[PDB]
Design a binder for this molecule. Structure first.
Ligand SMILES: Nc1ncnc2c1ncn2[C@@H]1O[C@H](COP(=O)(O)O)[C@@H](O)[C@H]1O
Ligand SMILES: Nc1ncnc2c1ncn2[C@@H]1O[C@H](COP(=O)(O)O)[C@@H](O)[C@H]1O
Ligand SMILES: Nc1ncnc2c1ncn2[C@@H]1O[C@H](COP(=O)(O)O)[C@@H](O)[C@H]1O
Ligand SMILES: Nc1ncnc2c1ncn2[C@@H]1O[C@H](COP(=O)(O)O)[C@@H](O)[C@H]1O
Ligand SMILES: [Mg+2]
Ligand SMILES: [Mg+2]
Ligand SMILES: [Mg+2]
Ligand SMILES: [Mg+2]
Ligand SMILES: [Mg+2]
Ligand SMILES: [Mg+2]
Ligand SMILES: [Mg+2]
Ligand SMILES: [Mg+2]
Lengths: 202, 202, 202, 202, 202, 202, 202, 202
């Protein structure tokens, strides 16, 4: 029960009229984070749940007060390209909603690998690292070889052609777990940040 | 340089006359040497060369060198779905233990006879990290993931068989919902325990 | 001919102007159930066939009188998550239209497995069990091991990423038929309820 | 506990010295013991150990123990598309019979020479349940399913071959339309008959 | 050059403003048939090419005069279900535009196989048979075994789930070519009727 | 009954002692008997039993019985892309000839050295039907299909190899554009010639 | 840094309000080419960046002055069908923006192979050849065998059915690299022209 | 006719008694003869027949005839990801050198230990063309492609293994982003070097 975790509603298939109904049911108990919440659904709820915030790029709403970092360290969220940033903020906002400090390192993909070496120590000073990437997926391989903290890698569905909406990054990423890497499902920013938050709070 | 980890040998693509070559190249470590995926015919080839080495048959791993105490008092729980998983479970198990981790094995607890899984639930919940290894019924990872509030790393196993050579287990674990599961690639129990070991010792 | 079954029009590709034409053709003979009937098509037919009912969540229209249970027992329709409920009501409404009592057990997925043990006897007291699930598909494995009545399992296309719109549940579900489970096609709530109704009426 | 079923041995992953181990562990049942997928070399290994056991060559099943009468007077019809199916058909057949079911075999009736299938249509229609086993021409299940108003369980068989190792038969049976068909996974005649047997004895 | 064939514009990717431009270019020479012509594109061209006809269900426009049957026999176009009829009329209209008599046998799928035996001689009296079907694809197997004229089979992309938009019929159909069957690409009504017309005019 | 065709034996799944069983069951035909896919070790097993039979090594076909004249004066052209195709080309070739067809072989004319293909273009164009057999470079079927105004049946061959075991050739031929091509399934030269033979004799 | 290349913004996922922001950031330095720029996004930017040009068919905007050919030779862009022309102009416009002369040879697909032999010398007089094609993909095979300059082949996603949105051309094209051919990703006109420009400027 | 290239033998499908047949058919060239994919058992079969020939074991290539000087002073760099790549890297290497190219090998520089790759970056950058050969970690091609402003041809290697037999490496290289990469098909180091050699000598 009281395991110290917020509440997570799969806001993708649920109706705006329903999300109020689910929030207002658990509104007396416990922060309430909702993931994959369209901009058309937050507008329809804005006055019905007038405390909630909305992170546009992340498609996440939070009703309630995000805690202060309960752990002295931080989580590195590392992005290969700007197109990755929505699923990145889904991770970074759920990690912050679960009580973790988060240091963002966006747009340092391998096609300009000096950008990643520029922040290479910030990454190393995190307790966990989330690596997000599309197309090639190469970035998680690169970081996994270069840091000695747990790395959770999120493939994304960005790009085109034989990206197979994320399949090629997922395969690339799975093929480098021997370097200290685990992988979540495509676009699953929330899901990597939930295991990330657990790792970080130990 | 010195992150404490033992020396790893990928012994599937190295030769018997070439393994003894790097093992004794680092015979001044005082740190253990773990050799993964070493077929039983290749340990008989070196058994004269390294009389002291230990060989874990099911796990195809050979350890040379004095094991010191566990590094931290928590344990990694290794949960297996069926007997066909025992080998790749034992590769995770032996790697985790060589790396300094206490390991508690919880084998044959697939959801076909789920009472088995509640039998040893106290043990699973007590671990700092849970490695779930499952073949055809990769549904075990989700069942676990929704019963523990600790990190779960899932290892899909290939076992031949509308399981499409384990590809279904990999897909089933990725698409699992007990948020808190994170997936390595097929049969890679080593790398699971490598990420597990980092997670435990933090 | 007179085998005791209603009439089933694949209302997906057929036009609203046509469904009236098909209903009004067989309207003199025999209940008439139509499956995959959009809400935009029922409005266009509401006055042209003003007796029919419409189950919104199920996307099924029935013109005619649903029979009373011709069998003393009931069919358990068991759902893993709320997102599964449309295809669940397609099953539950066709099972009721074919003359079966139906006991619904919705939202008891494995990510909170206590909810399923809460209703575990209701399931067992059914003559047939329909298990519906998305993403992981785990639930059908779990129930198949726990009841000793025929279980028909419907994968659904809900979730995201490597769900492959239902493929991962279908594979998961097919891989547990040795526990007394058969599987229908993705989203095929109607089709599992048609075999279910046959089983139940013996 | 006591659901009446006989004892099942998955004899593909068990060893010859280990099979005689559980068979004689339950030699006080008075109930039959059915051992599926037992290669002809493994029955010669035990033929001394169990002189009374019967072995059904094509079906790779070994039955130890006195078969009592059929439990119910209806029969299961086992329909096979071609000769290449005889083995997995015979695994369904022998399992169904060991479990207490009268079984009527209707073999080699594929739609290439469909007059064969109308030859023995009276027999098929007379069954309480029909198990259809088909390789390349998995179209047989639909043809049957639209000629019988009784439950049909389809078993796709692998036979090597743009049949993609049976995957086409599995897909073809799932996507069948004679509503009333339900599919097990590849080559799993046992589990088909296990669901068939439940359906018959109800 | 003058091989006796009409002109065939892939009207799918081409613009309405362009199709007039392509027609009016070859309008002085030679009938002009255009395939995959949307209803939104024919309206935009109706006054610019005011002689052309439009077959709504077929999405084909013909500018010019369809010839009278230059061959005494006819082509049987055989459809399994009503959902198949668009791609059927794409075949039947291109076969008629190329000078062939066409006898249509729609909706006689295997789920009611008596309907096909009702027309079984009409099919046999054709010089070529086009078999169109979705979902299961079974129908082409059935007819191929029952007629001894060339059968060209068109899979369609109708149905749902693991139809894989036509892939399961294509596979089913390819797996019965030993009965005197060739297969075209999914939905390719025009393409089967072009080989059909050649066969018929010999 | 009597459509003129010779007797066919699928000799891949029949046994050597069982082949001589049906061959001499119909030794009163006066019509030829064609046995396809007969391995060279299985013809040596019967060579005593049938001293008169002919065996075409590359094609794995054995013909017993007096070949009468060709039934019609046109010929079938069998075009092969490379040497690796010679076997399945020769199965089409020998079947077509046993069935009563004049056959002109045009081998090794792949588009890598396309001048070879224009070398024997007069011959190809002169055929009533063209069977194109191609492995990796299945592009040959389209090239032919757009140079002949006669029916083209394409046979994809498996040859191991990012050709995905011939699946690419099958997909490439289906998606060919020289409208006038029709595809059989992988390696099935027999059935190609069976449809070819019907087309030629009409 | 100053390697002589323009600037390339993946204008697909980026917002119109952002592309101005990215252009106007690098507007002081260095031509600026933007690829996959919708017609709805260029209108919204037309007054904010009023120097840029827009190639409608190519979906490319260029802000800045395209250089004159810095190399005396030219690049042949060769198209199989008119449907290929968008991705062709994406290549031809990026090759021209990077300083290359470009000779276009559109619509000479293999279904009318005389059209390609008509321009066969123009192709040969280029220093590099880009071959673009859909459906069959055959054209790259044909040209690769016929020119002895580097050939870069772009599969496209045009056609239907088992085109698998470009997969069949990609496979066909990859299967002819032994003739002096490399392949880029589906629809990647820009990407083949970037390697093409490098080759040409040596 | 005379493009300068040496004579190539595809020695995987040619026989040992047939190889010596064309090698000595062109023994009046004064130009070298390169024989690719020649197993070590097939070179021992000819070693008497051609005493002067050289055989490169790892690369399965045999070269007969006097190598003249390099044709142009630039070199091709052949970069390999791991040891498992050495064979197909060496086929590219030896072909490039036989064709007249200076070749600099840069092996074992995968991104797991990326410092290795910066070790020999000066050499890589100095090449006119870079052939990148990579198995599981096909991410190497992108890393290179974004560090060199010269043409990169990538060769995916099959190595068994959630790498799906190299298919992931092929997909990963296609979907790479360091624009400047171009991909051959699986294991085809020869054809890579054939395109590489053309690119270098221009
Ligand atoms: N964005 C997300 N991705 C994956 N799983 C999620 C996401 N949001 C919530 N979940 C999980 O999905 C389940 C919700 O199931 P449902 O009852 O269908 O809402 C819970 O286990 C949530 O933690
Ligand atoms: N929702 C459904 N899913 C699958 N099959 C269905 C569905 N509704 C009807 N059918 C079956 O599809 C066939 C109707 O074919 P058609 O002539 O195309 O309407 C019949 O066998 C129906 O029982
Ligand atoms: N519906 C269709 N399906 C397949 N191929 C077609 C179709 N309509 C026309 N074609 C062929 O596609 C080619 C037209 O190429 P394009 O120049 O792109 O129009 C010709 O070979 C036509 O015969
Ligand atoms: N049309 C395109 N196709 C593929 N890659 C592209 C395209 N346009 C730009 N790129 C590359 O994609 C990268 C841009 O990454 P991003 O930061 O997400 O814009 C650079 O390497 C560009 O050269
Ligand atoms: Mg970027
Ligand atoms: Mg690491
Ligand atoms: Mg739920
Ligand atoms: Mg059960
Ligand atoms: Mg119908
Ligand atoms: Mg036929
Ligand atoms: Mg064209
Ligand atoms: Mg070339």
């Amino acid at each position: 029960r009281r395991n110290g975790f917020p509440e997570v509603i799969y806001g993708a298939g649920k109706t705006a009229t329903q999300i109020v109904g689910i929030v207002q049911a658990l509104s007396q108990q416990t922060p309430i984070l909702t993931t994959r919440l369209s901009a058309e659904k937050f507008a329809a709820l804005q006055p019905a749940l007038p405390t909630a915030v909305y992170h546009a790029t992340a498609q996440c709403m939070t009703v309630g007060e995000q805690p202060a970092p309960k752990t002295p360290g931080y989580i590195a969220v590392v992005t290969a390209g700007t197109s990755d940033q929505p699923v990145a903020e889904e991770a970074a906002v759920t990690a912050e909603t679960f009580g973790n400090r988060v240091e963002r390192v966006y747009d340092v993909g391998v096609a300009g690998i000096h950008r990643l070496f520029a922040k290479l120590d910030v990454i190393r000073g995190a307790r966990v690292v989330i690596v997000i990437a599309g197309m090639e997926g190469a970035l998680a391989s690169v970081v996994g070889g270069l840091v000695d903290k747990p790395v959770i890698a999120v493939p994304t569905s960005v790009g085109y052609g034989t990206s197979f909406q994320g399949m090629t990054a997922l395969l690339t990423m799975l093929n480098s777990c021997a370097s200290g890497i685990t992988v979540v499902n495509i676009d699953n920013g929330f899901g990597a940040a939930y295991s990330a938050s657990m790792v970080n709070q130990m």
